[PDB]
Amino acid sequence: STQIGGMSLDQARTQLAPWTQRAAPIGADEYQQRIERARVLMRAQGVDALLIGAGTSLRYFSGVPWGASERLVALLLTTEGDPVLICPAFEEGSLDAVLQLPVRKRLWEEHEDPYALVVQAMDEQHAHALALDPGIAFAVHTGLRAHLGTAIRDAGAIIDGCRMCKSPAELALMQQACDMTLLVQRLAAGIAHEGIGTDQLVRFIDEAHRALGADNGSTFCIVQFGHATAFPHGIPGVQHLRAGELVLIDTGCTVQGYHSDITRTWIYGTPSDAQQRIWELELAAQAAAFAAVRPGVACEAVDQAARAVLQAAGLGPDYRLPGLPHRTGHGCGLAIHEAPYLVRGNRQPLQPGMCASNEPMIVVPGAFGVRLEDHFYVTDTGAQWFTPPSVAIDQPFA
Amino acid sequence: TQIGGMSLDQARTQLAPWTQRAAPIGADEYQQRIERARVLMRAQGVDALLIGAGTSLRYFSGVPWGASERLVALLLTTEGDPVLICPAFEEGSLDAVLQLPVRKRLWEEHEDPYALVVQAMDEQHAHALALDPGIAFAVHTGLRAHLGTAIRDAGAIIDGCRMCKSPAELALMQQACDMTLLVQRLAAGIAHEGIGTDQLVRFIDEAHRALGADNGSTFCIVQFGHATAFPHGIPGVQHLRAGELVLIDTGCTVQGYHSDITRTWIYGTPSDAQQRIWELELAAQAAAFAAVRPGVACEAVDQAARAVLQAAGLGPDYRLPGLPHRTGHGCGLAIHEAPYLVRGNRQPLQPGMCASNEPMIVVPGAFGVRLEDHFYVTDTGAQWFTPPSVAIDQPFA
Ligand SMILES: [Mn+2]
Ligand SMILES: [Mn+2]
Ligand SMILES: [Mn+2]
Numbered sequence: 001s002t003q004i005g006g007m008s009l010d011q012a013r014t015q016l017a018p019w020t021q022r023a024a025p026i027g028a029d030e031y032q033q034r035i036e037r038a039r040v041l042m043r044a045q046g047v048d049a050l051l052i053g054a055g056t057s058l059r060y061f062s063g064v065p066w067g068a069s070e071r072l073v074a075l076l077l078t079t080e081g082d083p084v085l086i087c088p089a090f091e092e093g094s095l096d097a098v099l100q101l102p103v104r105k106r107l108w109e110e111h112e113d114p115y116a117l118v119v120q121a122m123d124e125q126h127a128h129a130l131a132l133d134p135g136i137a138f139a140v141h142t143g144l145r146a147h148l149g150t151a152i153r154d155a156g157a158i159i160d161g162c163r164m165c166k167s168p169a170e171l172a173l174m175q176q177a178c179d180m181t182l183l184v185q186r187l188a189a190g191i192a193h194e195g196i197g198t199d200q201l202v203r204f205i206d207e208a209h210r211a212l213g214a215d216n217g218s219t220f221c222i223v224q225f226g227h228a229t230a231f232p233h234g235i236p237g238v239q240h241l242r243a244g245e246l247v248l249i250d251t252g253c254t255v256q257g258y259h260s261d262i263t264r265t266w267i268y269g270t271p272s273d274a275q276q277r278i279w280e281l282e283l284a285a286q287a288a289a290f291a292a293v294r295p296g297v298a299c300e301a302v303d304q305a306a307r308a309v310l311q312a313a314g315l316g317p318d319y320r321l322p323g324l325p326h327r328t329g330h331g332c333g334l335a336i337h338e339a340p341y342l343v344r345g346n347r348q349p350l351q352p353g354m355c356a357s358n359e360p361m362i363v364v365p366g367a368f369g370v371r372l373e374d375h376f377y378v379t380d381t382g383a384q385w386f387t388p389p390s391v392a393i394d395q396p397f398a
Numbered sequence: 399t400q401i402g403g404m405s406l407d408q409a410r411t412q413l414a415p416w417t418q419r420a421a422p423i424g425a426d427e428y429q430q431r432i433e434r435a436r437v438l439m440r441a442q443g444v445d446a447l448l449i450g451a452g453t454s455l456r457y458f459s460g461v462p463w464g465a466s467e468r469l470v471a472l473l474l475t476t477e478g479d480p481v482l483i484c485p486a487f488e489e490g491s492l493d494a495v496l497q498l499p500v501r502k503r504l505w506e507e508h509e510d511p512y513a514l515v516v517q518a519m520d521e522q523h524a525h526a527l528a529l530d531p532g533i534a535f536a537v538h539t540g541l542r543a544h545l546g547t548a549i550r551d552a553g554a555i556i557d558g559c560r561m562c563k564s565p566a567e568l569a570l571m572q573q574a575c576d577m578t579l580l581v582q583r584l585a586a587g588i589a590h591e592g593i594g595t596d597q598l599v600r601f602i603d604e605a606h607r608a609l610g611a612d613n614g615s616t617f618c619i620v621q622f623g624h625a626t627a628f629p630h631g632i633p634g635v636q637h638l639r640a641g642e643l644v645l646i647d648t649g650c651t652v653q654g655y656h657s658d659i660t661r662t663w664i665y666g667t668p669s670d671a672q673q674r675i676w677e678l679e680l681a682a683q684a685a686a687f688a689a690v691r692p693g694v695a696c697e698a699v700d701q702a703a704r705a706v707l708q709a710a711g712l713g714p715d716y717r718l719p720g721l722p723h724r725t726g727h728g729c730g731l732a733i734h735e736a737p738y739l740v741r742g743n744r745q746p747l748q749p750g751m752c753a754s755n756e757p758m759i760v761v762p763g764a765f766g767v768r769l770e771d772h773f774y775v776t777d778t779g780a781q782w783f784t785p786p787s788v789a790i791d792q793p794f795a
């Protein structure tokens with residue numbers, strides 16, 4: 001190997017300059033385009049009002065990046081006019097400073113009923129067919145239902161109808177985040193040595209993400225050694241690296257809210273025949289899944305292409321272990337997981353601009369797991385990798 | 399003497415792993431929480447309770463996982479081990495975190511998890527479901543596809559369990575507060591002219607980790623000078639100058655239980671206005687604490703703080719200069735939870751309830767002063783988790 005081990009912490013740090021290729025933020029015109037696309041989808045669904053809660057969908061339509069809390073902060077979009085922004089009174093100044101869209105502020109003091117404000121705004125515009133953000137807390141349904149007597153639809157089709165296909169600016173922001181995380185993955189492999197701790201790697205990866213100018217360091221970071229790699233959702237526990245162990249690292253960051261999410265699995269020292277066999281199979285399943293992607297292709301077909309490779313090698317079938325116990329991938333954007341899902345049963349056709357992970361992890365019970373994760377986006381004629389796949393068990397980077 | 403003068407190396411000699419470790423919640427207490435939920439369910443005519451991944455699932459089952467698009471949930475009915483609905487591929491990991499005996503019902507990726515919930519309801523002849531108000535609305539959509547019956551809001555049941563803390567819960571929160579109080583103290587000590595907000599944030603995370611928090615700082619806000627007048631403003635690096643107030647709001651978790659402490663202190667010489675407002679903030683916090691005892695409505699605690707501000711000529715109500723938001727919020731496995739110390743909330747305080755006391759004063763465009771310490775209700779009054787600040791230049795008792 002020329003990529004694994006052999007780099008000091010100081011040497012890694014010389015490569016950690018703030019990222020010089022900064023993708024442009026989403027502009028005012030694009031936020032308006034998103035509002036207009038939602039209105040088209042609302043009309044198709046027969047909905048005349050849309051309530052978006054704080055979180056990734058509020059940031060999508062308005063630029064407000066705040067996480068959801070027990071206090072209602074929401075955008076109410078109707079067929080005409082600037083959308084209504086419902087917000088705590090004490091937050092008005094902070095809101096003005098992050099909004100990217102002209103809005104009609106409706107402010108509530110702490111003891112006042114914010115749900116009443118939503119319905120009042122609906123009534124003023126003669127709206128009586130609300131679709132509610134499926135990511136919003138159920139408590140908001142309770143609050144609304146105290147004032148509303150009409151059917152409340154689930155807004156998922158509208159929200160996915162907008163967010164699944166990324167604009168060039170969105171792709172560029174995801175691209176930047178992916179490029180940064182790919183470097184961090186490379187440096188993490190470089191500094192690995194006998195005895196190094198999983199916690200030491202997590203800490204360095206966060207440090208590197210910050211140094212490169214991520215929104216907020218590592219969004220998340222999973223580091224697993226040896227038998228711990230057999231768990232897609234294993235408990236964090238400190239391990240120290242021994243020769244002969246696989247190392248699995250899954251991490252990512254955000255840039256203007258847009259996510260990277262890359263997994264590398266590589267050998268420290270000499271691999272066993274079994275580790276070698278399963279690693280090559282993982283790459284082949286990932287490759288086949290990618291090869292299945294072009295416009296019009298059903299999402300489940302991408303999952304099945306990966307399973308076909310595993311089955312031909314005598315793993316599986318279906319979700320059986322040794323094999324692939326979960327879906328092949330998930331969409332990615334302002335959220336770590338979003339539509340479309342590359343999962344059995346999903347007939348959703350792939351369209352240009354859709355972004356998804358490609359990670360058909362193999363688990364061998366009691367032994368290890370191998371997960372390669374790279375994201376792609378659909379193009380007019382096929383697909384494009386955000387990051388190129390690994391080359392070999394001891395060459396994690398193309 | 400508490401502010402400035404300490405080197406980074408001096409501070410680090412006080413950062414050994416915490417030696418007074420509170421005991422983790424035991425198996426018997428999880429059973430007590432389930433039984434308490436069942437009593438409250440029955441009292442409300444509810445025969446099934448669905449708890450989603452998040453702080454309530456951790457409360458009842460020990461599972462710490464954050465919510466995702468995949469349903470992970472506990473279904474509690476009137477009898478038998480509660481049902482745990484979980485993706486099949488996660489069973490192994492689920493087993494390793496569960497603190498409660500359960501009946502696992504596993505779904506493969508293409509299968510409908512909502513169907514499992516309703517199958518489990520039907521098996522026990524349940525048809526009066528209450529649903530976790532913190533769960534994604536998507537779950538209502540999924541359940542409604544399968545149910546003709548009302549899906550009630552489980553907030554009253556869940557709060558009825560979680561608002562009053564056990565001794566073990568208090569001890570875990572107490573440990574988190576003690577650790578964060580030390581980190582706050584060390585942060586004041588290493589402060590110096592030109593120090594960066596980002597530098598303080600990093601130290602505070604380093605300190606939380608060294609002491610043995612679950613995962614460093616849960617959050618950390620550090621603001622200098624006029625920035626203190628903008629509590630929810632866009633973060634941007636500042637460098638400290640003499641004459642500026644410093645506001646630090648940070649916390650950690652211990653076994654999931656939260657600390658959340660704010661200190662505001664002067665670096666250098668304060669102005670008369672800074673001084674007078676700081677004193678008023680302390681007095682508002684103290685009056686709110688003095689109103690706390692069993693039987694007092696939560697809104698009276700908020701009003702006690704406002705009364706102090708209005709007697710001094712600030713406000714009234716939420717007007718500025720003054721207190722533009724509520725006086726405080728409950729705290730436990732979540733940073734914010736019931737009960738809320740807010741106008742309109744008639745909820746009577748009961749022994750064991752935990753809440754923040756933080757009646758911040760904002761002077762628009764100038765500065766803000768926030769003192770935040772949490773308390774719990776005792777049999778006859780209240781107890782501070784951490785003692786309040788003493789002066790504008792003595793943040794620690
Ligand atoms: Mn992923
Ligand atoms: Mn990942
Ligand atoms: Mn607080």
Ligand SMILES: [Mn+2]
Pocket residue numbers: 647648658659660770
């Ligand atoms: Mn706080």
Ligand code: NA
Pocket residue numbers: 045131153154155156157158159
């Ligand atoms: Na919809």
Ligand code: NA
Pocket residue numbers: 202206218219220221
């Ligand atoms: Na991390």
